[PDB]
Write a protein that binds this ligand. Structure first.
Ligand SMILES: [Zn+2]
Length: 173
């Protein structure tokens, strides 16, 4: 049961990278909403770890305004390539991250569960919705954001249409 004490040992590191690439405001809400959803229960802080990672991935595509089943990634061109472009212009991610999941679906599933470890290298030397929730997702799109960028955020903010709003406007830029 590491999620108890351990989660604090790893999390602290997960925030160091996220909190640094994440908007203070959002980080203030995510913990506020996610705190009111589950409450004080440990499940809340537990979902914050997973929601934090999946969020980092987006921070890449959107554009970083700042500055192991994945370790083998180095054996892939997309890494050395996407990393050569992404680091130069994360704006080329949306199109890349797509070609990555279309070619290597096994890795795409990992890179998502290993953002930090996936970023450090990328920053250093080498659905489930319905007609009731949907209307809530696209609601953020009209804000001037891709249709997919919403499906992710919405689910990234715990389906919190109130949170995503800030997550979209606080996603850099
Ligand atoms: Zn950043």
């Amino acid at each position: 049961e590491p999620y108890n004490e351990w989660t604090l040992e790893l999390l602290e590191e997960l925030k160091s990278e996220a909190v640094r690439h994440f908007p203070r405001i959002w980080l203030h809400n995510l913990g506020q909403h996610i705190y009111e959803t589950y409450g004080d229960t440990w499940a809340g802080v537990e979902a914050i770890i997973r929601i934090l990672q999946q969020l980092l991935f987006i921070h890449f595509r959107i554009g970083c305004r700042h500055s192991n089943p994945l370790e083998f990634l180095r054996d892939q061109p997309q890494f050395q390539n996407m990393r050569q472009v992404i680091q130069q212009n994360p704006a080329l991610l949306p199109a890349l991250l797509q070609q990555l999941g279309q070619e290597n679906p096994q890795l795409l599933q990992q890179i998502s569960r290993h953002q930090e470890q996936f970023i450090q290298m990328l920053n250093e030397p080498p659905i489930q919705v319905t007609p009731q929730e949907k209307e809530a997702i696209e609601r953020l799109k009209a804000l001037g954001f891709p249709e997919s960028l919403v499906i992710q955020a919405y689910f990234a903010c715990e389906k919190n249409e109130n949170l995503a709003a800030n997550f979209l406007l606080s996603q850099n830029f």
